Amino acid sequence: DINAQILRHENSAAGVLSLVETLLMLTKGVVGVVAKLGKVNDENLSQILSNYLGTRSMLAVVCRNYESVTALEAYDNHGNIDINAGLHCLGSSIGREIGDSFDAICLENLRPYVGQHIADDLQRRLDLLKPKLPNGECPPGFLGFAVNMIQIDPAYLLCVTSYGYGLRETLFYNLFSRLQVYKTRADMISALPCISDGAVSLDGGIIRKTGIFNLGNRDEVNVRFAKPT
Amino acid sequence: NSKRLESDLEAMGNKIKQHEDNLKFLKSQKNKMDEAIVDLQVHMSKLDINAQILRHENSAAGVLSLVETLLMLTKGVVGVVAKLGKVNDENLSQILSNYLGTRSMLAVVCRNYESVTALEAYDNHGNIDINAGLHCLGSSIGREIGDSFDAICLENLRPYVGQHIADDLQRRLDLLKPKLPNGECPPGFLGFAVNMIQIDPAYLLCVTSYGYGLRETLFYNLFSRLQVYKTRADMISALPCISDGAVSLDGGIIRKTGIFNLGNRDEVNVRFAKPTASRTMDNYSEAEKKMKELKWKKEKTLEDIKREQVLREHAVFNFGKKKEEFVRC
Amino acid sequence: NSKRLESDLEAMGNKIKQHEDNLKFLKSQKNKMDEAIVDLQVHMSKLNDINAQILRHENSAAGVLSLVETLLMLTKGVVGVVAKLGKVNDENLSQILSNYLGTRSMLAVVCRNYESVTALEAYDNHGNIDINAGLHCLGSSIGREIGDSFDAICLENLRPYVGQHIADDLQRRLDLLKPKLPNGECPPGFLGFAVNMIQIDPAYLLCVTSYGYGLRETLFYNLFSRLQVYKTRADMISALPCISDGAVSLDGGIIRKTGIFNLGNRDEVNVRFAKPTASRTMDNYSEAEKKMKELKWKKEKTLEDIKREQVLREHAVFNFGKKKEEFVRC
Amino acid sequence: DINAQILRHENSAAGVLSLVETLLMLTKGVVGVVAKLGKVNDENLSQILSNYLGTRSMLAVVCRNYESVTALEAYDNHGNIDINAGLHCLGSSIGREIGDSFDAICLENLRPYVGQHIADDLQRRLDLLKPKLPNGECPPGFLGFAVNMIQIDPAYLLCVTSYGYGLRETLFYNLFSRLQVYKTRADMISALPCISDGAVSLDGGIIRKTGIFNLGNRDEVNVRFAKPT
Amino acid sequence: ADEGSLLRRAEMYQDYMKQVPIPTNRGSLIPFTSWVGLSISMKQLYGQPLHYLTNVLLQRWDQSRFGTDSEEQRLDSIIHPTKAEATIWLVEEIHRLTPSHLHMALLWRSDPMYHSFIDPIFP
Amino acid sequence: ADEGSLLRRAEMYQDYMKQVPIPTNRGSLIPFTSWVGLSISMKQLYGQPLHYLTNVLLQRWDQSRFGTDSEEQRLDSIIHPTKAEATIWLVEEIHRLTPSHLHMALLWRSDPMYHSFIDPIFPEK
């Protein structure tokens, strides 16, 4: 169960909102937690996308406008985050506190993916350009783009922000910004000139940027995307 | 018909003698470069952060720092990101380290991608063997590497595709300052973060094979066009001006335009070093960067020799086949 | 979304207002150009043989135009004659350049645009010259008729010299890479290129063509394409592999192409480039004329940018009206 | 008859060589006169190509090497062309003198056209690029290139110069250097952007260069190319 | 006074050359001697100006051939004119869509009499 | 002593670049962000250098986009990559066949450290 995985990280704020959801305008403005919003069909691909995003952006709260961000936190003249903020008073009243910094995404100020879509497919998958080698078709290990891997709740496909953009155009585009998913580490290295932003190998390591290579014993992230039901 | 063929191989022999003369000229130039670097090398020979690396015992940067306190692996590695950059004040160093995070802060950085391939080994299962280079070295001297660590290669980094400030020392990048819709600048703006790092002058130029600096390759790909704002309310007040990233000198940071961080700031114990106030070390480092520039130009003249060698070999093969064709006719 | 379209319509309103502000900006700068050119007109108003050799060629059209200059829109379109525009210091080298050009290219008429070329002649259905043409009507109205095939040059269609210039000097003379021996040096009898020898009238140094090109860059570069002047004949044959298209000896014979040589009794040409008379007062007046022509060229370019911005404003008007109608209909 | 047309221009040297041919090493080195070497099928096209070249390049003597050029003329220290030159002594001995300058072409120093030929056609016609309008095929009045109009003597197709080049590659390329032949004056003006060097209209006027327009009452040249027999 | 004026001129000209569409049919074959000869011909077969950056680049490509005796080598023998028109249309599309007006305002601040590369023609 | 070395180096380099063929199969799609990123990825797929003048031109194109807020537009979306890859191949063919080494030696004399643009990639093997 995914809510237990949220509640394991007791120093987070996502566990605080999950404890609210089990039992103000904070939970009215907040759309929710990133790991709640995305669903992945299999297990391994969900694990590696979670290892790509990390446990800090995976447990990010997602709210609509910046007024909700000002609702979540309150600053005095000292510049310190006192107890009198929103989720700090809420956690002090209910239970566990928040000692870790956590991520607050606002969907209004994000950069929408103002590019064409696939016409006939459900979930409004992105019409993004696929790379090709000099000889022929696609690179040999090319499984596809990771922003189109996410299986989403059909309530959130339209009019989530004020301009009528979806949630794949705003949230998951700005988390998974055009990164390839490859089957083999060797197929990821052999197609290194064609990858623009990032690449994720379906067995092992990943790369965030062009020159930056992540390698070594694979650090795991406890939170994963849910199964689709 | 025969006279133009005779003039053809006559001119072809003239060209191959021209090739040989050009080879001899470039060997002369390489030997002059050798004499200059031997003279400057005997001129040179005539004349705490490590605890913070070693607190991360599981990290590979602590492994390399411990082995440096005691192969081809530690020759290809240029170093560790925490030991390359230097910041004057303490607060800004703490905040930039909090911005980068402890995985990219402890990143090993090497020149060529073959040095990346030498650090690890992978089998058909894809699991990280102990037979990997850093894992063999760490297990042979002690603790193992269970944390995932970062490996930057300086060749595959996309260099800043832009100008510098010409007269200024340390090659501070000029970027376009953020602009209001009004004619003024935002008030909290002190500078971009990538210009804030003061760098060892040995690493200012010729680090890359193309002669790129290290502020161009490493720190621009880490600190890519982000601002450093004095107070928090300056950073919120100048939100439409910011493009890639923003950092407040008081408190919190933001990674993208809409992504906001808030909450208790998790600190990063690994920091940038403070600079050294000595002056004779600066004179030795200027001698070092002069040596590095001379070594880079020597490498480029060696590559130019290689180009001309390819030309003369193809010209010799063409001359032999043309002589055979004319004698057969 | 209706709110997105309403914000976009307000943005298009801001766009059309900044277009009309740009119009007012350019109209003000055009009025400034008009003020400056009228000031230079009143200052220039305050500051205020080859003809016989032209008239000897009675059958040719250059004599027709010179006789009219002694006594319509044709004289508006035609810049002049090639012999009038060039001036060469010494008598000998003037005669040798005239012998190189010949009496057809020397007596050519030069005019600005191609419609000025079509204004000179009128053709029938059969294609023969009918007297209803302008020069034929006007020459038959005044006197002699044009039996000689004469030459017409339009400055706009000429291929400009796609090369650099000499920076530090007046007369804008053309730097070209001097000829070189296969090993040694430059050839010894080399006296210079011939396109640099012609001293241009300083009225015609800048802003004659609509692009702003000079007259040396367009006319005399096309008549004298990269030919060298050599002092003696034996020096000229001695520099045979070094020469480009043309070559001329300052004593005798001239050659046209790389293999073609001329020899035999030299046929002279009656018309000649004049010797320039360096008077400082007329030099100052022609300097003012050069300033006039440069000002008028910049005024024409600002007027073209005004036409450009009017086109943009009308496209913005049509798009704003169509979008607002679609929004009201929505 | 073409020899009468050569002999009309009594002040020439081509009439002098024709008078020799009717009755030294000069006539051994000289290949001959340009109007003798070229033949044109019809009359009008021959007349307009003759008007293009002019009566000075039409009556040009053509010799092989520059030693023949030094054989034709002799210069003293005065720099004047005295009687003691080759054709001047020859004309003074035989008859008429030479008071006009005439053109002496040497085939060794000319610039050969190093371009692909048409494979199957006789006379070794040049493989030259034909212009095309933005819509489709060739310009509407395009009759073709004037260097390929010349019908030549089959003795002179090969090994005329020392390198084995023909005579179309050397002489007629350097006289007719890629100029179009158009049927109508209006079809010549309407295809003015496509013409590179020159253009010749089959009814009337011609242009030598791009900006230079020849017009007026058409000055005729008495010499023409011969008929092919 | 010159700075804002040149910046405004650069913005207006870049707006117009952004507005102009690349033409539909490109099947043509112009014989040509130099690059500027092909551009002057191709501004006449098509009723469209070229960009400032395109005219400046073609003049520099033309000056880049001077010196060594390949000037007497005719250029369309080296480059098939379909390829040369393809280069000039693709380079003009790049100079129409992408560039900023700040870079171009700097380039115009470098030299006066910069109108020798702006074409008078307009569709 | 300077200018003779510059001229002879420029002549040798120009001869080497005229020697290099342009490849047959050029059908590929490289998603790219800047011009220099396309050039680097295309040097890595096709084991061939680019010219000096090509790399100068691509850097000046890439600097021309700074300024106006068009960096936020991904250049992949403005120009289709097959189009821009065709532009860079044809401009490379222009800079390989056409140029004289005298002008290029003049440009090398105008600024030192001209090896930043010359590629160490050899088409051999």
Residue numbers in the entry:
A (entry chain F), D (entry chain D): 117 to 139, 147 to 352
B (entry chain E): 52 to 98, 117 to 139, 147 to 405
C (entry chain C): 52 to 99, 117 to 139, 147 to 405
E (entry chain A): 39 to 161
F (entry chain B): 39 to 163
Question: What do the authors report?
Answer:
All together, these observations have positioned the DDR complex as a key component that acts downstream of the methylation readers SUVH2/SUVH9 to recruit Pol V to RdDM loci. The structures of the two complexes are similar at their core—two DMS3 dimers bridged by an RDM1 dimer.
Using single-particle cryoEM, we determined the structure of the DR complex to an overall resolution of 3.6 Å. The two RDM1 molecules in the DR complex form a dimer at the center of the complex. Surrounding this RDM1 dimer core are four DMS3 molecules that form two dimers, each binding to the exposed sides of a RDM1 monomer of the dimer core, opposing one another. In addition, the two DMS3 dimers bridge to each other across the RDM1 dimer core using two CC arms. Interestingly, while the two DMS3 dimers are similar to one another, the two monomers within each DMS3 dimer differ in their structures: one shows both visible hinge and CC domains, while the other monomer has a visible hinge but unresolved CC domain in the structure. DMS3 dimerizes using two hinge domains in a hand-shake configuration, forming a donut shape. Our cryoEM structure of the DR complex also reveals numerous interactions between DMS3 dimer and RDM1, with a buried interface with an estimated area of ~31% of the RDM1 dimer surface area.
